[PDB]
Amino acid sequence: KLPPGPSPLPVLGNLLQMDRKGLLRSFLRLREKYGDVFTVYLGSRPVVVLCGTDAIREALVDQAEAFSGRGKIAVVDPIFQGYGVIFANGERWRALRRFSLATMRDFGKRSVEERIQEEARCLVEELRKSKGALLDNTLLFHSITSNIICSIVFGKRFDYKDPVFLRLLDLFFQSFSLISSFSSQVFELFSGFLKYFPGTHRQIYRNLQEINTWIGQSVEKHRATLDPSNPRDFIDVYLLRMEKDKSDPSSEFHHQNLILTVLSLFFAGTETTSTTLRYGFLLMLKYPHVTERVQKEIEQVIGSHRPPALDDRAKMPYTDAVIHEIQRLGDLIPFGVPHTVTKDTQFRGYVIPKNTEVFPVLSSALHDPRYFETPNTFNPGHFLDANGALKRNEGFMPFSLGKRICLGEGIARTELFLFFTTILQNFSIASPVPPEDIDLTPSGVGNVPPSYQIRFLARH
Numbered sequence: 001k002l003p004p005g006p007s008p009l010p011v012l013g014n015l016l017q018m019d020r021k022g023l024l025r026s027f028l029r030l031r032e033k034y035g036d037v038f039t040v041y042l043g044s045r046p047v048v049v050l051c052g053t054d055a056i057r058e059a060l061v062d063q064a065e066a067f068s069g070r071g072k073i074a075v076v077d078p079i080f081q082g083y084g085v086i087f088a089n090g091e092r093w094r095a096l097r098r099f100s101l102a103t104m105r106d107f108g109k110r111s112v113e114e115r116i117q118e119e120a121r122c123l124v125e126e127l128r129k130s131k132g133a134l135l136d137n138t139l140l141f142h143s144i145t146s147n148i149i150c151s152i153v154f155g156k157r158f159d160y161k162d163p164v165f166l167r168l169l170d171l172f173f174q175s176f177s178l179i180s181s182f183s184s185q186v187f188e189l190f191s192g193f194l195k196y197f198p199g200t201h202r203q204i205y206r207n208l209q210e211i212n213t214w215i216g217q218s219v220e221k222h223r224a225t226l227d228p229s230n231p232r233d234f235i236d237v238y239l240l241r242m243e244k245d246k247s248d249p250s251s252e253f254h255h256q257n258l259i260l261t262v263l264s265l266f267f268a269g270t271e272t273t274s275t276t277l278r279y280g281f282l283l284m285l286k287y288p289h290v291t292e293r294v295q296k297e298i299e300q301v302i303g304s305h306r307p308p309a310l311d312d313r314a315k316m317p318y319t320d321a322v323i324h325e326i327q328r329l330g331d332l333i334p335f336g337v338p339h340t341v342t343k344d345t346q347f348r349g350y351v352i353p354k355n356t357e358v359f360p361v362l363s364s365a366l367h368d369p370r371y372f373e374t375p376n377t378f379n380p381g382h383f384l385d386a387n388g389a390l391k392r393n394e395g396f397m398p399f400s401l402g403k404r405i406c407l408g409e410g411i412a413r414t415e416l417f418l419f420f421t422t423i424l425q426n427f428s429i430a431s432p433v434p435p436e437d438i439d440l441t442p443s444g445v446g447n448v449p450p451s452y453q454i455r456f457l458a459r460h
């Protein structure tokens with residue numbers, strides 16, 4: 001009754017019909033032979049894969065609760081363990097999502113935008129200072145994306161220099177590198193055998209643990225300084241809701257969901273945002289004309305004497321369409337984040353046993369040639385009608401769909417916009433590599449472009 005797909009061997013599963021290139025490339029290859037919806041065996045585990053804008057939507061939207069179930073990721077389950085907004089399920093998840101969605105919106109009393117505009121203003125100020133000397137943005141873009149989350153959870157930001165922050169940051173974002181490595185992906189398949197032998201997991205473990213300590217401490221500092229009647233941020237609030245569920249012990253709001261939820265926010269809403277920015281600027285180096293037009297749109301719709309604001313977007317459909325296409329091509333989460341089916345489930349003739357894991361190749365949507373003329377080529381065109389207004393697009397689900405749809409799409413949207421329009425507002429770019437020779441070819445649960453040098457040339 002499971003989707004078709006090559007024969008499993010026990011212990012190993014479909015190890016053999018996979019591609020050395022990687023988890024993503026493997027699926028897409030099986031899709032060719034076995035179709036839009038197949039079953040593939042990751043050792044013991046049967047996984048059903050959803051390729052295409054229809055397949056994915058039919059599950060995530062047309063059957064959204066069936067498919068609301070989060071799945072595991074092997075290298076980090078030992079840290080997260082089913083706790084926290086991201087890896088939660090059933091009741092645990094809903095109450096956590098309900099909470100975070102509500103909470104982050106309100107408190108943190110400067111508005112989510114404002115905090116971003118401030119963070120961008122600092123960026124401009126910090127960038128100015130390098131007087132147009134080559135640099136790898138990676139750090140700063142980790143920094144700003146991290147300072148944003150920080151502002152939400154801790155009620156504060158960090159200077160780009162303060163070196164404690166950087167030490168922690170450095171080792172936070174070392175984890176992602178490792179999370180998306182080949183070793184991790186092998187670990188994914190056979191972690192029952194590998195958890196005993198040394199390998200990147202242990203390293204990932206101790207990087208996260210180390211953070212969960214600093215957080216642990218920021219939580220203890222919060223309780224001891226708390227003003228109930230005037231909360232500052234996400235932790236203040238989770239605490240106040242914690243005491244308001246004192247008498248109830250089947251409630252979900254305990255210390256361990258607090259910690260792994262604050263961590264969770266860093267873990268989802270940093271790299272991915274940051275890498276999108278990194279990638280974005282890489283594309284603006286390679287096709288300057290776009291940049292020119294964006295800088296130009298900025299001159300018309302915003303001018304040069306005020307900062308960008310989130311409202312300027314509605315009137316800047318080109319820029320907006322670039323940011324859209326940046327996400328699409330960046331394809332930064334390419335096989336989405338594992339799902340499970342909360343019930344036994346009817347789908348396309350097939351039946352998927354309860355809790356079976358489900359992988360929505362989002363990349364197959366992003367490069368759906370029915371919704372994008374030139375899917376492998378960078379093309380704002382993809383998002384613009386005959387009158388040059390923004391164009392919706394079914395194939396555009398980088399933040400995924402259904403009930404597990406990215407909780408942050410929003411910050412990230414606002415971030416991407418306000419960072420992009422504000423940087424470009426103030427600096428033009430250049431680099432050693434001529435546009436013609438810049439290469440974009442990156443692959444793991446997150447994709448990553450190459451490292452590159454760049455120049456931020458102040459404009460007067």
Ligand code: HEM
Nearest residue numbers: 086268269272273336337398399400404406407408411412
């Ligand atoms: C470019 C930026 C971002 C992208 C592309 C992105 C994409 C995604 C995707 C694809 C998922 C999984 C959707 C699924 O369940 O299949 C996800 C999950 C999530 N994202 Fe993001 N995200 C981004 C930024 C952020 C930010 C900035 C935050 C928070 C401030 C955030 C919070 C979350 C949370 C909480 C989840 C868990 C979903 C759940 O279990 O309900 N994300 N993100």
Ligand SMILES: OC[C@H]1O[C@H](O[C@H]2[C@H](O)[C@@H](O)[C@H](OCCCCCC3CCCCC3)O[C@@H]2CO)[C@H](O)[C@@H](O)[C@@H]1O
Nearest residue numbers: 015016017018019020021022023026182185186187189
């Ligand atoms: O006799 C052994 C055979 O090994 C290969 O056969 C298959 C095998 O199934 C396999 O050996 C290999 O497939 C490559 C799979 C490697 C798995 C690596 C994955 C690990 C986790 C996720 C990323 C990649 O190559 C061929 C792909 O179909 C080769 O084709 C030949 O050397 C030979 O026919």
Ligand SMILES: OC[C@H]1O[C@H](O[C@H]2[C@H](O)[C@@H](O)[C@H](OCCCCCC3CCCCC3)O[C@@H]2CO)[C@H](O)[C@@H](O)[C@@H]1O
Nearest residue numbers: 146150158164165166168169170172173211214266270
């Ligand atoms: O009384 C207040 C004291 O705290 C100050 O800052 C603490 C600051 O409270 C605290 O803000 C700072 O944190 C730096 C680490 C931030 C890490 C956050 C990361 C999480 C994961 C992703 C990257 C970001 O650690 C500092 C050093 O211990 C200073 O440490 C002291 O000088 C000062 O006296």
